Amino acid sequence: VNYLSGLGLSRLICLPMALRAAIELNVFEIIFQAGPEAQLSPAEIVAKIPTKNPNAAIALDRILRMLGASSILSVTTMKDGRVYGLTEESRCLVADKNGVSVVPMLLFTSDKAVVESFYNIKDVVLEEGVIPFDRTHGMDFFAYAGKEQSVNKSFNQAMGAGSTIAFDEVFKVYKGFHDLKELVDVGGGIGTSLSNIISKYPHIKGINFELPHVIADAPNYPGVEHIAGNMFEGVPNAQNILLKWVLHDWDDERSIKILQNCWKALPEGGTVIVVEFVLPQILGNNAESFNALTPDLLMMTLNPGGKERTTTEFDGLAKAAGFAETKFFPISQGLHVMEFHK
Amino acid sequence: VNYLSGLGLSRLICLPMALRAAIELNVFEIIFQAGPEAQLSPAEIVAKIPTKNPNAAIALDRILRMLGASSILSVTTMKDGRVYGLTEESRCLVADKNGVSVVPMLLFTSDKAVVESFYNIKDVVLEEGVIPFDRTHGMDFFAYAGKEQSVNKSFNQAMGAGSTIAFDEVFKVYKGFHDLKELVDVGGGIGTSLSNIISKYPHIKGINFELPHVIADAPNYPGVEHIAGNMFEGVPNAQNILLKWVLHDWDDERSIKILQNCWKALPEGGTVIVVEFVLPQILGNNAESFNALTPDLLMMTLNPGGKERTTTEFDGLAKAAGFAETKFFPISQGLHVMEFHK
Ligand SMILES: Nc1ncnc2c1ncn2[C@@H]1O[C@H](CSCC[C@H](N)C(=O)O)[C@@H](O)[C@H]1O
Ligand SMILES: Nc1ncnc2c1ncn2[C@@H]1O[C@H](CSCC[C@H](N)C(=O)O)[C@@H](O)[C@H]1O
Ligand SMILES: COc1cc2c(cc1O)[C@@H]1Cc3ccc(OC)c(O)c3CN1CC2
Ligand SMILES: COc1cc2c(cc1O)[C@@H]1Cc3ccc(OC)c(O)c3CN1CC2
C-alpha cells in the first residue's frame, strides 16, 4: 500500500471551510451578476469584494481552486490562470428575486455550535442515551436556541430559507393545499412555511404553533397567526395540520407522541400533511441519498434521537399513532409530501 | 432553478466529521482484521467495539453509510442490511507492520484547534498580514504548540507518521542519501525523518535542529542527536541539510531567510535536500493536484504565509538564497525531493 494516497483525505475537512469562506466573501453572487453562465478570474471577483488587501486575488484563488478541483465551482484553466463559474449546486447560493438562497442553511449547518457537537458524534455509537449537542453544550438544541439569540436567529433563518425553497418545489407537484380552509403548522418555525402556503392559497387561515422564543423572533407575516405551545402537551384543535422537518428531529417514541397529539386535535376527516426528505432503502452516490444522509447526520449530532426515515417507517409511525392510511407524494430529489389520514 | 439542489452542500461538513468518528471507533482496523477484502455489517463491527449500547450498530450504520455513499468505504446492501469494506484510500487508515498509517495526520488536520482557525480563513483574502490561526488563538502555530501539549503531541505525531510514509516512498526512487556523511535536519520534528535516514544509511550522523518543545516531545530514536535552536537566527554548521515540510510553512521572505542560513552553514558543494509536495503549474484531475491543494489550504489557515509552490517557484527560492543549481526528483503523486546546490 502507498500511504501517500491516504494523506489527501485531509481535503474533506478543508472543503466545507473553503465553501464557508467563499459564501462569506460573496463569491457566488459576484459570479452570477456577470451572467448565470459566467466564469470570472480571482481579480475580477475581488473587484467586487471590499478589501484593500493587494494580495486578495492570490489568496482568493487558493480557496476557489480547491472548490473548483472538488467540482463545487466550474473551472476553465486559461493561459493567464483559472476562471470560475457556478455549478448546479453552487448556483443555489445565489439569491433569487425574493432574496432567498440556501446560504442561511449552509452557514447554520457549519456553524461553530454544530461543528463543536460533531466531535462527539461517536458517542451515539458508544453510549446509550447521549446526544452530542447536549453533551457538548449542557442542554438540548431547542433549549439552547431559547438561551442563545445568535443561534436562535441562525437556525430560524436556515429553516425559513429552506421552507421557501421547499414549498416553491412542492407547489409544482402537490395540489393538496388547494382544498384546505384552515391549517395549523405544528413546529412551524418563524411562520415562513405558512406564509408561502397562504401566499399561494390566500383563502387559508394559518396558525403557526411554536416555542415562545421562536414566535418572538417571527415576522408578522400577513395571514399567519402565531400561537405559542408545546406539541408534546397537545396541539390546537385543527381541521388540518402541517408537520415539516419536525418528525425527523425525534426518535420514534417522541414522534408517535407528536402524531398522537395531532390525531387528538383533528376531526375524522382531518389530515396531517408531513413534509420531509425520505431515506431511500438503497443508498448510493446520488442526490436523493445525500439529501437524506446529510440531515440524518445533522439529526444524529443535534437532536434527541432524530433520524431520517424510509417510506415504510413513516407509514409505521402513522399507523402507530392512529392514522388509517398514508399517501405519498414524491416532490423532488427525495423530498416528499405525505398525507396521514385518520 | 431547483434550489433544493444546493441544500445537499451541507454534506461537506458532515463527511469529515463522520470520517473522524469512524477513525476514533477503529472501524477500518476492525474491517481489515476480517480479511483485507472483507465486508462487515455494522453489527459485526460493533462486536469488536467496547460498548454496552444496544443501539450501537444502528448508530454506526448511520456514520458508515455516509462514508459508503462517498466512496470512502465500499458498501453492499444484503438481506440483513448493509456491509462495508475498505477502499484504496481507506486502506491507508490501517496500520502497517510498523504501526504506521495516515491516522495521525487525519486526526491532526481535523483537530479542534485547526478547525477553529479555519473559520477565519476568509481574513487572508480581506486583510493584509492576518494569519487565521494567530487571529483565533493569540499566537502563531508553533508557539501555540509550545504552550498546549495536546496539540504539540498531535502535530508531532502527524508529522512523524507522514515522515515514515514519505521516506518509505522516497527510498524506492531517490538514492542521493547514500553519498552523505553528515546531515542536519533543519526543523526535523521529533526526529522520525532522521531515524528513517540513519537506519537506512548507518554511516550517516543525523542531527535534528528543532524548537525545544518539539525535542522535549521526541522519542529516544537511537543515533539521533537533538540540538535546540531557532533556524531564523542560524543553523548548525553542516555538510548537508534536510528541509522537509518546512519551506511550505513560510512565505517567500522567510523561506529565503531559512535557505540563506542554510547556505552560510554549508561548505562549497554542500546541498540542501528539500522534501515537499509540488503544486502543478496547470491543475488537473490527478493525485498531484489534490495532494498540493490540501496542504496549501492547511498552510493558509495555520502558518505565517505558508503556501505550496511550483517547480519554478522552488528554483526561484533556491537562486534567491544563493544556490547555483536545482535538481528535481519526482517521487510519487506530487511528492518531490529537490537538491539545492551551492
Ligand atoms: N415542544 C415543541 N413544541 C412546538 N415546537 C417545537 C417543540 N420542540 C421543538 N419545536 C420546534 O420544531 C421546529 C423544528 S425545525 C422545522 C421548522 C419548520 N417546520 C420548517 O420546516 O422550517 C423548531 O422551529 C422548534 O422550535
Ligand atoms: N524557528 C524555528 N527553528 C527551528 N525549527 C522550527 C522553527 N519554526 C518551526 N520549526 C519547526 O518546523 C517544523 C515544521 S513541520 C515538519 C516537521 C518535519 N520536518 C517533517 O517533515 O515531518 C516543526 O516541527 C517546527 O517545530
Ligand atoms: C439536503 O440537505 C439538507 C436537508 C435538510 C436540512 C439541511 C440540509 O443541508 C435541515 C437540517 C436541520 C438541522 C437541524 C434541525 O432541527 C434542529 C432541523 O429541523 C433541520 C431540518 N433539515 C431539513 C432537511
Ligand atoms: C496530501 O495530503 C497532505 C499533505 C501534507 C500534509 C497533510 C496532508 O493531508 C501536511 C499538513 C501540515 C500541516 C501543518 C504543518 O505545519 C504547521 C505542516 O508542516 C504540514 C505538513 N504537510 C505535508 C503535506
Side-chain angles (χ1 to χ4, degrees):
Chain A
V1 179
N2 185 344
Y3 282 80
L4 287 173
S5 300
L7 294 172
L9 284 167
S10 295
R11 76 179 176 276
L12 301 180
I13 189 62
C14 295
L15 189 56
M17 303 316 290
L19 177 57
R20 184 178 181 91
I23 289 169
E24 291 183 334
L25 292 167
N26 206 26
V27 164
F28 304 93
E29 294 280 0
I30 289 167
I31 292 170
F32 178 78
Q33 289 168 8
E37 68 285 342
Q39 289 187 326
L40 296 186
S41 71
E44 291 166 337
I45 297 164
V46 161
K48 288 186 160 184
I49 296 179
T51 174
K52 304 168 187 288
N53 175 16
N55 306 296
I58 288 171
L60 177 62
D61 176 71
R62 297 172 71 188
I63 295 165
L64 301 187
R65 64 196 183 179
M66 173 65 91
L67 293 176
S70 301
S71 299
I72 306 304
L73 290 167
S74 69
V75 188
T76 299
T77 309
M78 319 277 293
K79 290 184 80 74
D80 285 323
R82 296 165 281 276
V83 296
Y84 301 97
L86 305 171
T87 71
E88 177 183 6
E89 294 188 294
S90 52
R91 166 74 177 75
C92 300
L93 295 164
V94 175
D96 66 15
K97 61 181 70 177
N98 295 322
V100 175
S101 76
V102 304
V103 165
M105 185 73 76
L106 274 278
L107 292 173
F108 167 69
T109 60
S110 67
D111 187 85
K112 288 173 183 169
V114 174
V115 169
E116 291 161 353
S117 83
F118 260 126
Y119 281 92
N120 292 316
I121 198 176
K122 73 176 182 290
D123 293 351
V124 179
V125 177
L126 296 172
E127 300 180 53
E128 193 175 3
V130 171
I131 306 168
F133 191 92
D134 296 41
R135 166 158 291 179
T136 302
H137 297 285
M139 72 199 310
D140 67 269
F141 179 82
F142 298 120
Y144 191 87
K147 165 212 161 210
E148 251 304 324
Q149 189 45 220
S150 85
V151 172
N152 192 38
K153 291 186 165 189
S154 179
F155 176 63
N156 289 341
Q157 289 167 14
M159 299 303 102
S163 294
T164 296
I165 289 164
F167 278 104
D168 282 348
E169 298 306 310
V170 164
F171 293 142
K172 297 182 186 54
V173 165
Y174 176 75
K175 295 321 178 175
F177 292 102
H178 169 264
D179 314 76
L180 302 188
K181 183 63 186 168
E182 71 171 274
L183 185 63
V184 175
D185 191 354
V186 169
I190 55 170
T192 309
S193 293
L194 279 173
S195 187
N196 273 270
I197 291 164
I198 297 339
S199 182
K200 182 70 69 175
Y201 300 102
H203 66 272
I204 297 183
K205 166 67 160 178
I207 296 85
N208 184 35
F209 185 70
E210 259 284 354
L211 298 176
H213 61 262
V214 177
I215 292 168
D217 194 47
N220 289 307
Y221 288 117
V224 174
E225 174 182 351
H226 297 282
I227 297 183
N230 173 4
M231 66 193 174
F232 294 109
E233 286 294 321
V235 304
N237 292 330
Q239 283 172 21
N240 298 94
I241 284 165
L242 175 64
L243 220 43
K244 175 175 164 286
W245 294 349
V246 170
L247 296 177
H248 77 150
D249 303 327
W250 301 99
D251 56 20
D252 287 351
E253 302 96 319
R254 261 82 66 91
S255 285
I256 291 163
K257 180 63 173 186
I258 294 161
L259 287 167
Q260 287 174 326
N261 287 346
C262 292
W263 188 100
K264 291 182 201 173
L266 287 164
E268 181 53 30
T271 300
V272 180
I273 303 173
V274 177
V275 177
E276 295 281 12
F277 285 94
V278 172
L279 181 69
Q281 288 287 343
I282 299 155
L283 294 168
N285 184 26
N286 49 62
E288 291 85 348
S289 289
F290 280 99
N291 285 346
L293 295 188
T294 296
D296 188 64
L297 288 186
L298 290 159
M299 300 304 91
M300 190 170 178
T301 201
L302 295 177
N303 274 328
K307 53 173 274 173
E308 305 300 331
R309 287 174 177 97
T310 66
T311 58
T312 303
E313 287 177 306
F314 278 116
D315 184 65
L317 289 181
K319 286 175 163 50
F323 293 92
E325 182 175 332
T326 302
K327 294 157 61 188
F328 294 86
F329 303 83
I331 305 299
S332 174
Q333 50 190 288
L335 185 72
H336 284 65
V337 173
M338 292 163 281
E339 292 170 0
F340 294 178
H341 289 262
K342 169 167 184 181
Chain B
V1 181
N2 184 344
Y3 276 77
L4 291 171
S5 299
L7 294 173
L9 284 167
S10 295
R11 76 179 177 277
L12 299 179
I13 189 60
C14 293
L15 183 56
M17 302 315 288
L19 179 57
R20 184 176 180 91
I23 289 170
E24 292 182 332
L25 291 164
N26 208 26
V27 166
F28 306 95
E29 295 278 1
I30 290 167
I31 293 169
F32 184 79
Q33 285 167 4
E37 268 157 45
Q39 285 195 126
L40 295 187
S41 68
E44 287 165 333
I45 298 163
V46 160
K48 298 309 177 184
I49 296 178
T51 177
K52 301 169 186 288
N53 178 17
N55 304 294
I58 288 170
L60 178 62
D61 175 69
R62 296 172 72 185
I63 295 167
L64 301 189
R65 65 196 180 181
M66 175 64 90
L67 297 178
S70 301
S71 300
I72 299 175
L73 290 166
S74 71
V75 53
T76 303
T77 308
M78 316 205 46
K79 282 178 83 84
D80 286 322
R82 291 167 280 275
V83 296
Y84 298 93
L86 301 170
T87 73
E88 174 183 6
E89 288 189 294
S90 53
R91 170 73 177 74
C92 297
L93 299 165
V94 174
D96 67 14
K97 63 182 71 177
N98 296 322
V100 177
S101 76
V102 303
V103 166
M105 186 72 77
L106 292 199
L107 291 172
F108 165 70
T109 59
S110 66
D111 185 83
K112 288 172 185 169
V114 176
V115 170
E116 290 162 354
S117 81
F118 261 129
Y119 281 92
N120 291 312
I121 201 176
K122 72 174 181 290
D123 294 353
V124 179
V125 178
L126 296 171
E127 300 179 53
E128 196 172 4
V130 172
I131 306 167
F133 190 91
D134 298 43
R135 166 158 289 181
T136 302
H137 296 96
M139 71 195 75
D140 65 89
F141 177 80
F142 300 119
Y144 192 85
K147 296 291 295 183
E148 279 307 327
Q149 194 48 221
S150 84
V151 173
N152 190 37
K153 291 186 164 188
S154 178
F155 176 64
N156 290 340
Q157 290 168 16
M159 298 304 100
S163 291
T164 295
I165 290 164
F167 278 103
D168 284 350
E169 299 309 313
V170 165
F171 291 145
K172 298 184 187 157
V173 279
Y174 174 75
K175 296 322 177 174
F177 291 102
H178 172 262
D179 317 292
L180 302 188
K181 286 305 227 40
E182 185 81 305
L183 180 60
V184 176
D185 191 353
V186 168
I190 55 171
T192 311
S193 293
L194 278 174
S195 185
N196 277 272
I197 291 163
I198 70 173
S199 296
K200 181 70 70 176
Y201 300 102
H203 63 273
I204 298 182
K205 163 65 160 179
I207 300 151
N208 185 36
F209 184 67
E210 259 287 354
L211 297 174
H213 60 261
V214 177
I215 292 166
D217 193 47
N220 186 15
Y221 288 120
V224 173
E225 177 184 355
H226 300 276
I227 303 180
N230 173 5
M231 67 194 173
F232 293 107
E233 287 163 27
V235 304
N237 292 333
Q239 280 172 19
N240 300 96
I241 287 164
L242 176 68
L243 276 177
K244 176 175 164 284
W245 293 349
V246 168
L247 296 179
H248 79 150
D249 303 325
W250 300 99
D251 54 21
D252 287 352
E253 309 94 83
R254 263 82 67 92
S255 288
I256 289 164
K257 181 62 174 185
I258 294 162
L259 287 168
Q260 285 176 326
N261 289 347
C262 293
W263 186 100
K264 291 183 199 173
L266 287 164
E268 55 192 82
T271 303
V272 178
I273 303 173
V274 177
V275 176
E276 296 281 12
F277 286 92
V278 171
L279 180 70
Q281 181 68 42
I282 295 158
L283 293 168
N285 191 26
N286 47 61
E288 57 273 22
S289 290
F290 287 96
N291 285 343
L293 295 188
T294 293
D296 188 61
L297 287 188
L298 288 161
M299 300 302 94
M300 189 171 180
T301 201
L302 294 176
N303 275 330
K307 54 172 275 174
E308 306 301 330
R309 287 175 178 97
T310 66
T311 57
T312 302
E313 288 177 308
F314 277 116
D315 185 66
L317 291 181
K319 287 173 166 50
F323 292 90
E325 246 198 83
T326 55
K327 295 152 123 195
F328 293 83
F329 305 86
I331 307 299
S332 172
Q333 50 189 290
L335 183 72
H336 285 64
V337 172
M338 291 164 281
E339 294 172 1
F340 295 177
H341 291 261
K342 168 171 184 183

